[PDB]
Amino acid sequence: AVGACVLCNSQTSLRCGACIRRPFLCCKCCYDHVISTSHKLVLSVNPYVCNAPGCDVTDVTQLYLGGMSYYCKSHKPPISFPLCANGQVFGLYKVTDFNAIATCDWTNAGDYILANTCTERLKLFAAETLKATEETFKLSYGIATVREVLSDRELHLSWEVGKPRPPLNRNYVFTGYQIGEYTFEKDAVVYRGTTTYKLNVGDYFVLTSHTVMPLSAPTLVPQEHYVRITGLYPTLNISDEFSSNVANYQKVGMQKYSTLQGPPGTGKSHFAIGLALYYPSARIVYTACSHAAVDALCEKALKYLPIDKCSRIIPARARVECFDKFKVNSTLEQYVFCTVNALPETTADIVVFDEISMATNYDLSVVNARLRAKHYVYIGDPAQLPAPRTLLTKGTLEPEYFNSVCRLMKTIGPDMFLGTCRRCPAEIVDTVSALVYDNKLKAHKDKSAQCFKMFYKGVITHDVSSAINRPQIGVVREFLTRNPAWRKAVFISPYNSQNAVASKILGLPTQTVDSSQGSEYDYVIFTQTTETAHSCNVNRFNVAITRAKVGILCIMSDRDLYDKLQFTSLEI
Numbered sequence: 001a002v003g004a005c006v007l008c009n010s011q012t013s014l015r016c017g018a019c020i021r022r023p024f025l026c027c028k029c030c031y032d033h034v035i036s037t038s039h040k041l042v043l044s045v046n047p048y049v050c051n052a053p054g055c056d057v058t059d060v061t062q063l064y065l066g067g068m069s070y071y072c073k074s075h076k077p078p079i080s081f082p083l084c085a086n087g088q089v090f091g092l093y094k095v096t097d098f099n100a101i102a103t104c105d106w107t108n109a110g111d112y113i114l115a116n117t118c119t120e121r122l123k124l125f126a127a128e129t130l131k132a133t134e135e136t137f138k139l140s141y142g143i144a145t146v147r148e149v150l151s152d153r154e155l156h157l158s159w160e161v162g163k164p165r166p167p168l169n170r171n172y173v174f175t176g177y178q179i180g181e182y183t184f185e186k187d188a189v190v191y192r193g194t195t196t197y198k199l200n201v202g203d204y205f206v207l208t209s210h211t212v213m214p215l216s217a218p219t220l221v222p223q224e225h226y227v228r229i230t231g232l233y234p235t236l237n238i239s240d241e242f243s244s245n246v247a248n249y250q251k252v253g254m255q256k257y258s259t260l261q262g263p264p265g266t267g268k269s270h271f272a273i274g275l276a277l278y279y280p281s282a283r284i285v286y287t288a289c290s291h292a293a294v295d296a297l298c299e300k301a302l303k304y305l306p307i308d309k310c311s312r313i314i315p316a317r318a319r320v321e322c323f324d325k326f327k328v329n330s331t332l333e334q335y336v337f338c339t340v341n342a343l344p345e346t347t348a349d350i351v352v353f354d355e356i357s358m359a360t361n362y363d364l365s366v367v368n369a370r371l372r373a374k375h376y377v378y379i380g381d382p383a384q385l386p387a388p389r390t391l392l393t394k395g396t397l398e399p400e401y402f403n404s405v406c407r408l409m410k411t412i413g414p415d416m417f418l419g420t421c422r423r424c425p426a427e428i429v430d431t432v433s434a435l436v437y438d439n440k441l442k443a444h445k446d447k448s449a450q451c452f453k454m455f456y457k458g459v460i461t462h463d464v465s466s467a468i469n470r471p472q473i474g475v476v477r478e479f480l481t482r483n484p485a486w487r488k489a490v491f492i493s494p495y496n497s498q499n500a501v502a503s504k505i506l507g508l509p510t511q512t513v514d515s516s517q518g519s520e521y522d523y524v525i526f527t528q529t530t531e532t533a534h535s536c537n538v539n540r541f542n543v544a545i546t547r548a549k550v551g552i553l554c555i556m557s558d559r560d561l562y563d564k565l566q567f568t569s570l571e572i
């Protein structure tokens with residue numbers, strides 16, 4: 001009940017009651033909040049409510065101090081002072097953007113813009129508020145009960161009447177009932193249990209609505225620039241393999257934190273693992289939001305770093321399968337690879353946070369609270385995909401608003417930029433270079449002459465809202481018969497339901513653009529499926545076409561993106 005003001009830090013007994021996160025607001029700030037918002041409940045040791053029996057006056061503007069107690073205009077004694085006067089709310093120890101964060105529903109992009117352009121304490125207030133809103137919205141959905149079990153990989157579900165049905169995709173990870181987390185993909189649906197259990201009729205599934213903890217640490221610590229490398233001890237026998245990053249690894253030791261923008265295949269994990277070879281005695285904690293991102297850092301470390309000094313931290317609630325070669329849960333090993341939510345409370349010489357476009361400010365703050373490091377390195381690319389914002393339905397979230405790190409990379413530029421793409425045929429590198437990298441990304445590979453584009457709108461059908469284009473898949477089938485080398489291609493599309501249809505018709509492994517991020521394949525077959533803002537998103541398009549090492553086939557719906565593709569056009 002006695003704390004610090006979330007806007008000006010002045011100590012106060014006042015907490016805003018109408019705020020879902022109940023922030024401490026000082027006398028000047030509590031007033032400016034209650035007089036310009038629907039928020040009128042003020043909390044202290046005792047709430048600011050009328051003390052007269054059976055009275056329901058809770059608005060702080062309609063209340064007064066009757067000596068030591070509180071009363072409305074109808075119950076106050078003659079010697080009563082209003083709680084709201086001269087720009088203050090009465091309390092102990094006697095903002096436009098705070099109001100908007102406190103009262104928004106988080107469905108508009110302008111809400112997220114504000115949550116990243118505001119002061120540092122308001123970024124934390126915005127991040128807990130948003131995460132709390134996102135969790136309380138999980139309750140709004142209806143329960144799914146197993147009505148019948150067809151086989152080991154297929155079932156038929158029964159939904160709650162009156163409550164909406166959450167969108168069916170691998171993004172929504174449910175909690176079965178405690179029979180394990182379960183995921184669903186499309187009247188016969190496919191059931192995916194993270195824990196092997198013989199599907200029971202009658203058992204139900206409910207969302208993993210986890211409690212939102214308060215944020216204490218900033219999203220970014222205050223920046224420190226040094227005259228020499230601090231607390232880190234460099235090598236001189238630094239492997240030629242990593243010689244290109246020597247000036248960048250020194251930049252890492254002469255700053256508290258540093259940002260690395262690495263377009264696809266420019267050497268991000270090679271840079272991250274190479275930083276351990278450059279500072280060979282340094283204890284490095286490698287973190288990222290996803291298990292796949294942490295596993296990709298584990299794979300690179302398995303090749304360059306000693307396996308006995310490595311440890312893959314796995315949370316006791318082992319959700320899905322991850323890296324199995326390091327000693328598990330040995331928190332004290334020199335190299336610790338761990339997802340953000342599983343991080344222990346520890347210190348490090350360097351903390352490497354990879355896939356930074358996928359971090360929220362909540363993730364940025366959590367990392368600063370569990371890890372106290374001499375140096376922090378944020379690696380990623382604001383031209384790649386951000387973390388999905390389940391509440392956001394109106395407006396588009398631009399890269400400078402993904403998180404604090406992305407905001408910096410897009411405004412003042414990144415500290416370091418990996419300028420040479422070594423993965424993709426030059427047709428792809430030149431296309432994304434002009435599209436999202438202002439012509440600063442260079443191709444190492446030659447043009448493969450295996451990058452094709454076809455302008456074919458097809459027919460758009462829908463599985464609730466996830467889209468399907470059977471004619472675009474038919475064009476891919478006609479292409480495969482004529483180009484059998486493409487039999488080893490990964491089918492990619494912006495929609496789960498397009499992927500499910502293509503898996504049955506084509507037999508190729510499938511992946512959504514969002515799940516393909518960080519992965520690479522020799523051949524990629526992309527079908528745009530629709531002309532929505534989702535399928536036309538330049539960051540999603542960039543990720544989609546930069547998955548290919550050798551060739552790509554793009555069946556496009558949008559004239560704009562089709563025209564921007566520096567690929568050989570196919571006919572029919």
Ligand SMILES: [Zn+2]
Nearest residue numbers: 005008026029
């Ligand atoms: Zn204040």
Ligand SMILES: [Zn+2]
Nearest residue numbers: 016018019039
């Ligand atoms: Zn409030």
Ligand SMILES: [Zn+2]
Nearest residue numbers: 050055072075
């Ligand atoms: Zn009253």
